[PDB]
Design a protein around this ligand. Sequence first.
Ligand SMILES: CN(C)C(=O)c1ccc(Nc2cc3c(cn2)cc(-c2cnn(C)c2)n3C(=O)OC(C)(C)C)c(Cl)c1
Length: 252
Amino acid sequence: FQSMSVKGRIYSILKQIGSGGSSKVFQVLNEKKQIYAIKYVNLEEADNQTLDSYRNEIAYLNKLQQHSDKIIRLYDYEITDQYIYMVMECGNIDLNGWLKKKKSIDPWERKSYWKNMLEAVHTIHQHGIVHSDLKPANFLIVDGMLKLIDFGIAGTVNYMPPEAIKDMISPKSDVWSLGCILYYMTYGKTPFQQIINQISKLHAIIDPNHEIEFPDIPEKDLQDVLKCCLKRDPKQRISIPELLAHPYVQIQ
Ligand SMILES: CN(C)C(=O)c1ccc(Nc2cc3c(cn2)cc(-c2cnn(C)c2)n3C(=O)OC(C)(C)C)c(Cl)c1
């Protein structure tokens, strides 16, 4: 029931959505009784390298507002040397939680969600940003529409591209990750969710002789997309602009 001020405007805290390191996301009500999400960040113990990553992701979230509606709306913000307050639109639940709750996944729902993720990840790519770490928790359902919460600028290994393991990279990295999200939305498991051991799992994603199973499904376009996304060589892997012109996304 605590009330906070962001650029003069008063917000009434309804519940706490989540809490990062020195971060806290709340569900709030404004003076017009409209519902929003306020992210509070504590800069007390935050270093100069940390502050720039925060400033950069805010500016990117700010610029990409205009270019796409698949990026979470940033209404207002207040930045001081002590804290950050970001006033964003409120979603229902994140894709990671929603997929964990829903036993059955509708082909239309899946297709519509796939379309959204491609548009969001395409937008960040256009501006030169590659997330490099995509998991369903990065997406949020806002009125039956998937939206991108972060840009990997400011954690499960199942969605990692072989190139991220080989750096022990490029816009094609994000394609691999999106491929695993759709694979979970198609089969109900991640390509390597079978492997409990993390080092045996990492050895499998990097290995080409370890064949990923693509069971026969009533959706042949969905098979081709999954087969196209999950190619270990990023040069051989399908691009986002091509994925957007794919029959799976385009045909009724
Ligand atoms: C605990 N979970 C999974 C929930 O039930 C849940 C998850 C998400 C919810 N909505 C929601 C979450 C939201 C936002 C707007 N709405 C904005 C943000 C946000 C935070 N940083 N940035 C750059 C955007 N956000 C957010 O980060 O939510 C999580 C903490 C759950 C990931 C709500 Cl209302 C509930």
